[PDB]
């Protein structure tokens, strides 16, 4: 799985995700990546999310919408929503993975509960940060 | 506030011990080239949709990562790709699942979002839809 | 302990509908919700009750499920089903199946005997046949 | 599309949906019925939901949106169903209904269509059945 989220100059949020699934996967199976709210969610009012992880758990958890709903209805920060989903709810259901998320204010998060996550982010006209391992 | 892009290339069991610094820099180099293309585009005033679409297109084209080229095999030694894209402005979304004959699923996924009343297309239906709107048919061997 | 069931929401007009036609829908919904009550009162799992209710709504030709399923543009039947256990939060779904009498039964099987949440067509069908579910011709839905 | 939600004696919630899709459906299109949290959602701590209607129903996640409005927004079942079905969906040009049971045994059968073939009842009590509004 691979993903991108973005806030443009005009205040618009967008998310996208693409994958080849879990290695050795049964054909004719669907992971969370093509499911609005599981692999992928974007709403200009809340957040843009792209997740990656164990499929069943991210579907049953609606990981990507749940970030948005915790913010839009629960009044949580992006960082509190991410801590909740990725460090608390997912491991409890057996899901290891992470996500990338940008909120309408331009806060960025890249939570994961795995050894690593190939990730990168940065503002326009500024330099990128890149990561593999934790910290 | 400030226009910004995040990207990911997968999460899991990545061991320092199974990697040399140079192997790692391949991923850093690749990651940083994609995030930069995105930064430049945002800075140039481009939509968050176009930017996330190009970012995932490039993450797909990059074999280091499990999407499009470099995608993992199914139990039957084939490649089944899913992709989804969502515009927080229109709340429109498009997705393809279980496609094998499309170079770039994220591009097919946007196509479903934009020229279709449907949100999600699967297998041949997705591919027929995509081929009928001028998108090229490929052998899944290109992903191997 | 409680059950609700539905058989579709859409444009139904009292005009172009006789009381007797309306009673067959009322009789049907009524028989299925009773079966559900009886089961619940007997202490059957909320899963077993929702599964058998949807199986019955499928079997009933008046509803758009199993027998009485609508046709596609290409004069085929493509059935979808899903089930979710609020207790274990596990879910199972089949989309675009033609050769299974009772998609909801296949959806449960996917939930219980699969790591996967969602299976499609021949994948879903072959999965189900490999665990003793009978193959049917889509003719039976017409 | 057909559906069932239930709360058993042990406090377990479950939801189920089955359909043939839209009459004259373009083949290999996925509606909301097979999609967890769109056609269908159950949680013992919240609610069980079975929706019928599906472009808007996919993107709107009507079934999980009920649970989230309750669990995080502090809405009641009846407040949540009123919001999703009678405000948000009509606003997004999306016509249908759902059935919902919360963990406390509250029941709701909202729809924004002329009709919805529906029925419900507590165990040992006599069922209620419906087609048109009220
Ligand atoms: Na790739
Ligand atoms: Na039926």
Author numbering:
A (entry chain BBB): 179 to 313
B (entry chain AAA): 2 to 145
C (entry chain CCC): 4 to 145
D (entry chain DDD): 179 to 231, 233 to 313
Paper passage:
Variant RDM1-3, in addition to the R207T substitution, also carries a G206H mutation. The side chain of His206 is exposed outside the active site and occupies the space between Glu81, Glu125 and Gly126. Thr207 is hydrogen-bonded to the carbonyl O atom of Pro204, and this interaction stabilizes the entire 200–208 loop. Two other substitutions, D210P and S211Q, located closer to the nucleophilic Thr179, do not affect the conformation of the neighboring residues. The relatively long side chain of Gln211 fits well into a cleft surrounded by Thr179, Thr230 and Pro210, and forms a hydrogen bond to the Oγ1 atom of Thr195 and the carbonyl O atom of Cys229. Waters w3 and w4 are absent in variants with bulky side chains at position 211, such as Gln (RDM1-3) or Trp (RDM1-18). Asp210 and Ser211 could be substituted individually (variant RDM1-37, D210S mutation only) or simultaneously (variants RDM1-3, RDM1-8, RDM1-12, RDM1-18, RDM1-24, RDM1-29 and RDM1-38) without any loss of autocatalytic activity.
